[PDB]
């Protein structure tokens, strides 16, 4: 026999793959790319004013942030409809935008008494233990009174420099430009962004009723304690009113079928986890099954948790004069996409378990399997020198090059040098003598001396496997 | 093995013991070069725009209300070598120094 079981095991896998492919096709349309592109180009490409040539991406001073927040920002937000405000006469700006900042207090750090006679105040790096909570300025409204993270219904962000909190001093802008401009001018007249600020957030959302699909926007400007301006942005095309069309019902049915399939697989895996064999971890085709099941279970858990709580949208729809809070939904959508992509990638990789239909594929699979052990053995030795080079580059160049700034960047730039992409002219001025020595020795050693070992091992293993297979056939 | 491990521990302490200000130094130097308009200061090639340069972007920086605490007045230097030279033939410069 040995063929009736494999046929069922293959047809069920093909059905599951078809269902997953339909499901992943249904979630990735073509309008979202252009939607995001128009939003980004409207908000991140237009200059601050007609004379200045700096956009949001090239902010370089705290004065430039004030110049941007009145001008390009207000031009993008409020459009004179031929009251409400449609972004492109298509995208509706629902609610009102909100701006908030995080600041620290004076005397946070300690200047040495040797030079205390000239330095009066200091402000350390951002930290939860050393953030200001006292009122300042004219002291009327929420822009000058500290508000707890719990009352703001926010969460952390994990910015480039650090992980900011959700608290701070916030202010809800108006619904029309004539009042938002006045509010921003009032915030600028009194000193609201002094040396003590560390971050500033601007966020809003749009609907674009033509295609039922939201879009949340967040703009973050970071002020490090060492000076400078670090901008950031994020656009997320959410979708919260899913069940409108027939295709949406079809997608829901496909999701239910996928849940049934994953239940059947977990049942049939827990069935054979002990019956056919106990403690079978030497196959690598069953260690993949548990990964598939775990990833899919996590995906369904995230999906069922995210869509179960949409009370924010309803409570906004009761009264549309307040700021909608859609941060958590966007975060969970990003997490769900990240999980689903990996899940489908492993599902596609799983296909290798069945392509053994003839001698040509069987011998190739045998060659690939037999050469895994020594390749793994040599990979450790290769990566030891690779990480030694990475740490050398990080220590020597990791402060004046902008490309070796952190360890991950050193790893990635060495991988790119393996591809022969990165030029060497930006290292000699960083360091005159050790720069080109590093580049030359690294390319000399890793480029062919330690790189063709993989090819040699693979070639020798394949040749000897083929020779043995041919020899045993003739011996029989 | 014990001696090798002890030596590795010693060199790791020597090297990465203070490896927490490494990022801060990078951010500081990036902040300093961008503020002084490094790309603008390298763009000048004549000996007359230097003065408007350091008269509108350097003096407000070094001298200001708060203006990036200094710890020391700046200096200006010169060398003239007393063997004054003459202009070279036109075209590309003699990039070997004379």
């Amino acid at each position: 026999k040995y063929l009736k079981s494999v046929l069922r095991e293959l047809v069920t896998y093909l059905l599951f793959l078809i269902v997953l492919c339909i499901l992943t096709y249904g979630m990735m349309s073509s309008n979202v790319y252009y939607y995001t592109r128009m939003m980004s180009q409207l908000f991140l490409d237009t200059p601050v004013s007609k004379t200045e040539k700096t956009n949001f991406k090239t902010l370089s001073s705290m004065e430039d942030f004030w110049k941007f927040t009145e001008g390009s920002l207000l031009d993008g937000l409020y459009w004179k409809m031929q009251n409400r405000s449609f972004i492109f006469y298509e995208n509706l700006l629902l609610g009102v935008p909100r701006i908030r900042q995080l600041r620290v207090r004076n005397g946070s750090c300690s200047i040495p008494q040797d030079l205390r006679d000239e330095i009066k105040e200091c402000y350390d790096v951002y930290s939860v233990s050393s953030e200001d909570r006292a009122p300042f300025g004219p002291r009327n409204g929420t822009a000058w009174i500290y508000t707890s993270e719990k009352d703001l219904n926010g969460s952390s962000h994990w910015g480039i420099i650090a992980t900011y909190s959700g608290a701070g001093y916030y202010l809800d802008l108006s619904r029309t430009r004539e009042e938002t401009a006045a509010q921003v001018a009032s915030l600028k007249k009194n000193v609201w962004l002094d040396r003590g600020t560390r971050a500033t957030f601007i966020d809003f959302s749009v609907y674009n009723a033509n295609i039922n699909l939201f879009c949340v926007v967040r703009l973050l400007v970071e002020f490090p304690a060492t000076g400078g301006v670090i901008p950031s942005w994020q656009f997320q095309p959410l979708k919260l009113i899913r069940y409108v069309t027939t295709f949406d019902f079809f997608l829901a049915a496909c999701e239910i079928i996928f849940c049934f399939f994953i239940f059947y697989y977990v049942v049939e895996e827990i069935l054979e986890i002990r019956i056919h064999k106990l403690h079978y971890f030497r196959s690598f085709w069953n260690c993949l099954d548990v990964v598939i099941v775990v990833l899919s279970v996590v995906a369904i858990g995230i999906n069922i948790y995210r869509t179960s709580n949409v009370e924010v949208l309803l409570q906004f729809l009761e009264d549309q004069n307040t700021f909608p809070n859609f941060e958590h939904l966007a975060y969970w959508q990003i997490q769900f996409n990240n999980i689903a992509a990996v899940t489908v990638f492993f599902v596609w990789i799983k296909l290798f378990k069945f392509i053994n239909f003839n001698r040509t594929m069987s011998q190739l699979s045998t060659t690939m399997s037999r050469c895994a052990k020594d390749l793994f053995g040599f990979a450790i030795m290769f990566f030891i020198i690779f990480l030694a080079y990475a740490q050398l580059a990080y220590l020597v160049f990791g402060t004046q090059v902008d490309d070796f700034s952190t360890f991950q960047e050193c790893i990635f730039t060495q991988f790119r040098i393996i591809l022969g992409d990165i030029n060497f002219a930006e290292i000699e001025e960083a360091n005159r003598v050790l720069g080109p020595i590093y580049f030359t020795t690294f390319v000399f050693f890793m480029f062919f001396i330690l790189l063709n070992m993989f090819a040699a091992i693979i070639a020798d293993t394949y040749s000897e496997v083929k020779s043995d297979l041919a020899q045993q056939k003739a011996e029989m | 093995l014990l001696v090798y491990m002890l030596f590795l521990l010693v060199t790791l302490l020597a090297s990465y013991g203070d490896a927490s200000c490494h990022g801060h130094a990078y951010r500081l130097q990036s902040a300093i070069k961008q503020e002084l308009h490094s790309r603008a200061f390298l763009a000048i090639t004549r000996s007359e725009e230097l003065w408007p340069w350091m008269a509108h972007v350097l003096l407000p920086y070094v001298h200001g209300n708060q203006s990036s605490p200094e710890l020391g007045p700046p200096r200006l230097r010169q060398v003239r070598l007393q063997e004054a030279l003459y202009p070279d033939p036109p075209g590309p410069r003699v990039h070997t120094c004379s």
Partner: peptide, 21 residues
């Protein structure tokens, strides 16, 4: 939330030398 690398390096070296030993 500041991290001190001294104790981490010391413990890592001790664990590695124990494993090899």
């Amino acid at each position: 939330a500041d991290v001190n690398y001294i104790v981490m390096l010391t413990c890592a070296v001790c664990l590695v030398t124990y494993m090899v030993m």
